[PDB]
Amino acid sequence: AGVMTGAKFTQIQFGMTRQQVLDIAGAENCETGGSFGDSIHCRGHAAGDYYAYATFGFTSAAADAKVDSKSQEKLLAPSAPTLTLAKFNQVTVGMTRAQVLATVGQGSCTTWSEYYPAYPSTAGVTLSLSCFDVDGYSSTGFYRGSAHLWFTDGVLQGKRQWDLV
Template sequence: MVGIKKAVVVAGVAVGFVVGAAGASGAAGFSGMDKEKWDRVRFGMSRQEVLDIVGPTACAVDNKPATAESTVPTFTCWATGIEEFAPYAHLTFNADGKLYMKSFYRMSLPTAPTMTAAQYNKVAVGMTEEQVRKTVGTNSCVVTDLAQPAFPSTAGATSTLTCWTGKGSGFLAPQAWFSFKDGKVTGKHQRDVVK
C-alpha cells in the first residue's frame, strides 16, 4: 500500500509540474531535447557545455530560456514544447556549476514491456540492475534518472530503473520504479502492478 501511495504521489507531482508549466507558459516554445542528447550530456559538464549539446531553445528556467549564466540549479528541457504530458528532462548542476544529476520523463519507453506482478515481487534489495532486468524482462525497463552527487567521485551514485507491464507504456499504464545506490537496489515501489 505504501508503494502505491508513493508512486501516485510521484506521478501526481510529474503531472502537476507539466500541467502547471503548460498553464503558465504554453506558448514559450521550448523544444529540441531528446534521449540522444540526454545520453550525450555528461556529469561534470558546465551549463554552457550542456546547452551546446541540447541547443539554445530546449531548456527553461522559470519559464524563460536557460543560459550559461542561470543560477537556478535545474534546467527543464522539453522535447516538443511545454504541453500536458510532453516529454522533458531535468538537468541539475551542483554549487560549482557542474552537471551531477539528470532525469527524464517519457523521452524513451521500453520496446516490448512484459513485467508481471510475480516478477516485480521477486526483485529484492541488493540486486544489481542486470539481475533486475533479467527478473522483470529485459525489454520492460529504461533508466530514467542518474546522479553522481559526489562528482567527480562515483561513490554514492544513484539511478532509477522504470519498468512497465505487458499492458503497455502509456502514462496511466502499470509501472514500477527500482531505486539503486552504488549499483544495488535500495528500494522499489509500483502503481497498479500489484493490486
C-alpha cells in the first residue's frame, strides 16, 4: 500500500477517472474538496514543512471526468542532473522543449506540472519543469541549485533559477 510515490504517479495517466486515480494512489493518502476543489491531492512522505505530493486535475466535477492535469513535488528525481549557471544562461525564451533539454542536460529535469486545457486536444498544453544541478535536488528538504522552466504548446515562455554555480 504505502503513501503516494513516484511509481504511483507514473502509473496514473491522463484520461483516467477519479476512481482509477484513487485505486492506484491509495484512498487514505488522498483528499478532494476544500482547498483542492475538484482535484485529487495525494500525500507522500514528509518533506520540509509539507510533504512530497501529487495533484491530479480533472476535466470537470462530473463522475466520469478524466485526468487532464498531473502535478507533483518531490516524487520524482532527475536521472542525471548537469545544469549549471552557464547552461541556464544559454536557455532562451522561444526555445522548444527539445532545445531546452539539450541546453540544460537531458537528465537534469523533472516534470512539475503538465496540463491539457483543451483535452483531448493538445492545444494550449502547459508544461512546468524543475531542473537541477548535480547536487541540487532533494526529495526531503530544500533545493540547492535549481531552475523553473515553463512552456505553452512546447515553447519556452519563461525561466528562473536559484543558487546555480
